[PDB]
Structure 1
């Protein structure tokens, strides 16, 4: 199909997305950058979608975190979410798509700005949300591996899918874990969708980048980086460590698995067969910049190897 401005897409219903794309690229993502608002919008996809429990309720990827913001943004695990919700709300009001669609669309557009990134499959047509998520559905950084895996499993994700989804932490920072150092990233390349997160979380912790007694924080290997206790544990726990290590210097796997599992997450509470595939509207991401490496001055002995079956791969270090 050909839209009114000459751009093309497989399904004509998708043409409505092109003006939305242009608006968000400039006015949400600061001219199609992989920066703060991409990171926040990607986090929002998860905090919206994971509000889904057969037992407990919630409609998944339904826009509830915007529609029912007054309730959801006050949940403890949603600390800091209010900022991106407030930023996105006027776009939802201006354009003519549901909040659920907008959240997933913005997340997919944003990820596509990141070198090494992917096009997350995107489907159009989610109805407006009809209920708020229950509280206690979003994992927290002080939760155990058993708890995180049980919660994610309740929503439909296996442990290997959880590891896949955590490639998001390659383009990510924390504002509330240690509020003395807001904006501190989880890897050394928060503008690049790469395996650095899976490398750097495996290093022996050395220091706290800010203060030393924050709940849910582990020692980091680097002054410029923060480590979550959940990521510390997931990198090392026998249930997840082998999958974690398998991401290291495996860009094709990170790409393939993140796109597939993000699509699954974007469709929680939804039925793809009732939606329209608009995947081809998402921009083509740039190729990876940089390659897998240890930080300058580090060596393999600084890696806490946690996969009995397979030794940690030999990586070069920054000069």
Structure 2
């Protein structure tokens, strides 16, 4: 199909996304930058989608975190999410797509701004949300590995798929974990979708980048980085450690698995056979140019190797 402005897309129904794409690149992502707004929007895709439990309800990736923001932003695991919900809401009001479609579309567009990034498959047509997420369905950085895996598994993700989705922490920072140092990133390259997150979480903890007493926070290996206790444990737990290490210096796997697993997450509560594929509207991401590395001055002896089957790669 050819849209009114001449841009093309496989299905014609997708044409309505082009003006929306232009508006968000300019007015949500500050000129298509891989910065805080993109990171916030990616976090939002998960906080929307994970509100899905076979036994309790919730419609998964349904826009409920916006439609029922009064409720969902009261949940403690949603701290800080009000900021991005309030930023996205006017876009949903102005354009003619559901909040559930918008949240996933904005997340996919955002990721495409980041070097190393992928185009997450995107489907159009989610109905408006009809119920708020149940309470207590979002994992916290102070939850055990068993608790996190049980929650994610309840929503349909295997332990390896949890590791794949956590590639998101390669373009990510924390504001609430330690409020004395807001915007401290989870890896040394928060504006690059790369394997540095999987590398740097494997390093021995050395210090706290801000204050020392924060719930859900582990020692960081670097002054300019923060570490979640959940990522600390996941990198080391027999259930996840080998898959974690397998992502290191393995950008093709990070790309493939993140795109596929993000699509699955984006479709929680939905049926792709009743939606329209509009994946080709997402921009083409830049590629990486620099190689994966330990931080300068660090060596293998600084790595806490946790995979009995396979030694940590020599970087």
Give the alignment's TM-score, normalised by structure 1: 0.98
Offset of residue 296 of structure 1: 1.2
Structure 2 distance, partners of 1:125, 1:289, is: 36
Is the 8 Å Cα contact of residues 112 and 283 (structure 1) preserved in structure 2? yes
Offset of residue 287 of structure 1: 0.2
Is the 8 Å Cα contact of residues 209 and 225 (structure 1) preserved in structure 2? yes
Structure 1 distance, partners of 2:256, 2:288, is: 14
**CA deviation vs aligned residue, 1:169-188 (integer Å, no higher than 9, x gap):** 00000000000000000000
Offset of residue 308 of structure 1: 0.1
**CA deviation vs aligned residue, 1:99-123 (integer Å, no higher than 9, x gap):** 0000000000000000000000000
Structure 1 distance, partners of 2:236, 2:224, is: 22
Match in the other structure for 1:88 = 88
Q: Which stretches of structure 1, 4 residues or more, deviate above 3 A after TM superposition?
A: none
Is the 8 Å Cα contact of residues 192 and 289 (structure 1) preserved in structure 2? no
Offset of residue 56 of structure 1: 1.0
Query: SS at the partner of 2:235?
Result: helix
Offset of residue 289 of structure 1: 3.2
**CA deviation vs aligned residue, 1:238-287 (integer Å, no higher than 9, x gap):** 00000000000000000000000000000000000000000000000000
Query: SS at the partner of 1:118?
Result: coil
Is the 8 Å Cα contact of residues 126 and 270 (structure 1) preserved in structure 2? yes
**CA deviation vs aligned residue, 1:129-151 (integer Å, no higher than 9, x gap):** 00000110000000000000000
**CA deviation vs aligned residue, 1:289-313 (integer Å, no higher than 9, x gap):** 3211011110010000000000000
RMSD in angstroms over aligned alpha carbons?
0.4
Structure 1 distance, partners of 2:19, 2:289, is: 29
Structure 1 distance, partners of 2:92, 2:262, is: 21
Structure 2 distance, partners of 1:74, 1:309, is: 44
Is the 8 Å Cα contact of residues 48 and 65 (structure 1) preserved in structure 2? yes
Q: Which runs of 5+ in 2 are unaligned?
A: none
Is the 8 Å Cα contact of residues 80 and 175 (structure 1) preserved in structure 2? yes
Structure 2 distance, partners of 1:272, 1:238, is: 34
Is the 8 Å Cα contact of residues 51 and 60 (structure 1) preserved in structure 2? yes
Structure 1 distance, partners of 2:75, 2:290, is: 38
Offset of residue 288 of structure 1: 1.0
Is the 8 Å Cα contact of residues 169 and 197 (structure 1) preserved in structure 2? yes
Structure 1 distance, partners of 2:162, 2:42, is: 15
Structure 1 distance, partners of 2:258, 2:87, is: 25
Report the number of matched residues: 315
Is the 8 Å Cα contact of residues 187 and 200 (structure 1) preserved in structure 2? yes
Structure 2 distance, partners of 1:169, 1:275, is: 29
Match in the other structure for 2:10 = 10
Structure 1 distance, partners of 2:289, 2:215, is: 34
Give the alignment's TM-score, normalised by structure 2: 1.00
Match in the other structure for 1:212 = 212
Query: SS at the partner of 1:70?
Result: helix
Is the 8 Å Cα contact of residues 29 and 110 (structure 1) preserved in structure 2? yes
Structure 2 distance, partners of 1:305, 1:173, is: 25
Structure 1 distance, partners of 2:224, 2:103, is: 29
